[PDB]
Amino acid sequence: GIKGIYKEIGSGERISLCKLAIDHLEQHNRPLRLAIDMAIWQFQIQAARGGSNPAIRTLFYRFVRLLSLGIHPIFVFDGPNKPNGVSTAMAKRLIRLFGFTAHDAPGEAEAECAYLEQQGIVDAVLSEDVDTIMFGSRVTLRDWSSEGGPPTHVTLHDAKKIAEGPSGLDREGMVLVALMSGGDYLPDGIPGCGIKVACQAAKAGFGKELCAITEWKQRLLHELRTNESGFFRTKHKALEIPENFPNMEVLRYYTHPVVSSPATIERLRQEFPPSSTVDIAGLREFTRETFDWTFRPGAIKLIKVLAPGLLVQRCLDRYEESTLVKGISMRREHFSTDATPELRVSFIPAELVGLDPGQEPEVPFDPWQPDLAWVPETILKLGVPVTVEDWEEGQRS
Amino acid sequence: GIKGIYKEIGSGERISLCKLAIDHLEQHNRPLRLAIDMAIWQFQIQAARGGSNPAIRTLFYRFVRLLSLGIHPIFVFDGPNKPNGVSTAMAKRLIRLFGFTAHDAPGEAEAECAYLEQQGIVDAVLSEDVDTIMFGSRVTLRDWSSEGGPPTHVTLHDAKKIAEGPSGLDREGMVLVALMSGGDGIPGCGIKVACQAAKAGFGKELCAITEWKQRLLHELRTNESGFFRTKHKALEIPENFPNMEVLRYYTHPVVSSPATIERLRQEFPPSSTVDIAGLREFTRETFDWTFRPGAIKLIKVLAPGLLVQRCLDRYEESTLVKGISMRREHFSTDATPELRVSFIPAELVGLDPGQEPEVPFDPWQPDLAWVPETILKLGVPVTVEDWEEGQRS
DNA sequence: TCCAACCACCGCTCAACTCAACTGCAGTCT
DNA sequence: GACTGCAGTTGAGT
DNA sequence: GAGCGGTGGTTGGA
Ligand SMILES: [Mg+2]
Ligand SMILES: [Mg+2]
């Protein structure tokens, strides 16, 4: 589901997640909004030794990476109305602590994700696969990973470019494919079929699928048997077709998937994105209880990990004050960001995060000394414009 | 037929021809030797269609299959001393090009095949039916076919096990059945009754003759000893019966001379090198496998079997196998252990398609084939050991 | 007379393989 | 979920 | 050459 689909639509465009975030921020003058299917974690997350709760620990670092990218994420959870070891409660707790949004689909999350995109709530979808396209996604993302090392890239699929050849596969086309082929998921699918043949049926325009039904089935069946119109590579007489085909409690499951109410969509327009303020004291207590980051070493570990992303977040949110950036020392266009212009920024971690390791019991990295980080130039111009200008001025000299 | 013989002796054991070949090779430490009656081909190969000479083409592919099985075949042809649409000359020509042996019976091929087996020239007989048992065969094979696809299996009959119940049909038993059930054979008779006369010991017949005839004739009409299911006064028996010139057609069938048997004992199996250039010219002239495509076609089809022949004939040289990838015990071979070998077809066959006039399978790229582990251990032992030890890792 | 089981006999009917492309399976990592 | 070779099938031509 | 039902004939009994 759908097995062999990337042979037809393509594997997709590998692209820096940083580039997407910054390109969108430049074109639309606001941070990228992303719907993330919570199901993508199950196998990336588990397993990743060791220490205490390494599974949710990996989730923590992914969240910090989201902060540094300046993305407004909304995490969608599955609902009971469908036809690892990481607690949902803990996941949702960490989400809120990071100032992110948790959202519960009434049914399947991937359908809700696609729906949110269609309604303009989010700009793109990050999911397990491209099932989201069947539910109406236009820009869908998968495989958030290294390009190993740090997870910097995703694989982008565009529903409009896919529909424009060579597969000619659109939403209705893929629906027919799933309806005809596998089969191992949906009832009353065709035994000998078959993504190659199904895609050929879709390309022949059969993907309508406009609710009676009796006529369509026999035109399609006659074409399969005789290949008169030449819709297929060969004839297909041995391909006998179930009486429960086309199953239609399946059909709309795709064309009208159970998603949030219109009232819920309107609530989200007003309430998403949220204030997005990272709860520092909350994260300190969470990491202590969950990761055993206890005492002064645990506080310093938190500051080190959290300071860069928190720098980005406040830099975007705040839109005389070197309260964020102490200085700039270099410029680069690195391949990991697909040559996205970044500037080498210096900052004071402990001062930025706002925790004092002295208030913690004592049982190298000094959180009070300057630390360095690469931050996208675009983000820096928005938050610390005067600092960026001074650097630009010094470079002209 | 003998008609309805199989409901008496059993339908036979269906067995992988590969299993027979490899089992015999493991037990006797030399390839299986098989006598093949050329009469089997008549109503099997004329179902092929398309192309040039599809019947002799079918014969070609089965010859290639014989190479892959590592079997040493001797094809027996009929002779004139007996009491569609394939040329004998072309059949014999192709046989020699493959390094196989062609043998002319002085009379019926079946009798000669059985005789060859009795004399130790071959280990088993492949023929149309089971008549070979009457001529003295002990292990006889029939119906070399699919188990619907490639012809991997055969039906084995064992003369010893047949004679050991429940039919009790031995050689002289089946002779009596043949004598009685027509057709100077007895009208109204009768394999059920004939087989019952056999179990009553009447199959001897060791000659004068008049006493014997009047015992079963008295038993047929009275059933005193209970030899039969019922009485049989209906059956009246011809004066000529039992026909004696028929009896020794079975007990002493016209076959090759002792001198010929001795000739075969030292000449078979033969040197047996596949004539590559010969086959190239044959397939060009007969199948219209012309120019570079025809060369490539030959190389692809012939490379695997040719690999086996080298393997067994071996009995460092990576000139056969480039590597091993996997192990399997497939049902088509009756779980005969096979290894997935890689080889270069063109390099192995030894023909360059470049010397042919050109007009997607690349014969210079590695190709894969399943080859019986036993054969591989014999021909390329060092390669097999490297695979075995990398495995236990 | 007739049936019923058994049987010999008649008339009827059938008889491969390559090749490419494909689906589906079972590994596997995640 | 998706990738890889194997296996078995089908359709078309040999 | 072999598997299928039908046919007609023989045998021993109803
Ligand atoms: Mg999915
Ligand atoms: Mg015969």
Residue numbers in the entry:
A (entry chain C): 2 to 84, 96 to 159, 163 to 226, 235 to 342, 357 to 400, 432 to 465
B (entry chain A): 2 to 84, 96 to 159, 163 to 198, 203 to 226, 235 to 342, 357 to 400, 432 to 465
Paper text:
In our experiments, we crystallized a wild-type sequence in the presence of Mg2+ ions. Under these conditions, CtGEN1 is fully active, and the species crystallized is the product of resolution cleavage. The presence of MgCl2 in the crystallization solution induced cleavage of the four-way DNA junction by CtGEN1. Electrophoretic analysis of the DNA contents of our crystals shows that the crystallization has selected one of the two products, i.e., that with the intact r strand. The crystallization process has selected a single product of enzymatic cleavage, containing the 30 nt r strand from the junction and the 3′ half of the h strand and the 5′ half of the x strand, i.e., the product with R and X arms. The functional unit is thus one CtGEN1 monomer with one complete DNA product. We have, therefore, associated the 30 nt strand as one covalently continuous strand within the complex and will represent it in that manner hereafter. Thus the functional unit contains a product of resolution, comprising a 30 nt r strand, the 14 nt 3′ section of the h strand (referred to subsequently as 3′h) and the 16 nt 5′ section of the x strand (5′x) of which the first and last nucleotides are not visible in the electron density. The 5′ end of the 14 nt strand is located in the active site of the enzyme, indicated by the presence of a bound Mg2+ ion. For the original Mg2+ crystals, a single bound ion (M2) was observed, but after soaking the crystals with MnCl2, two bound metal ions were observed.
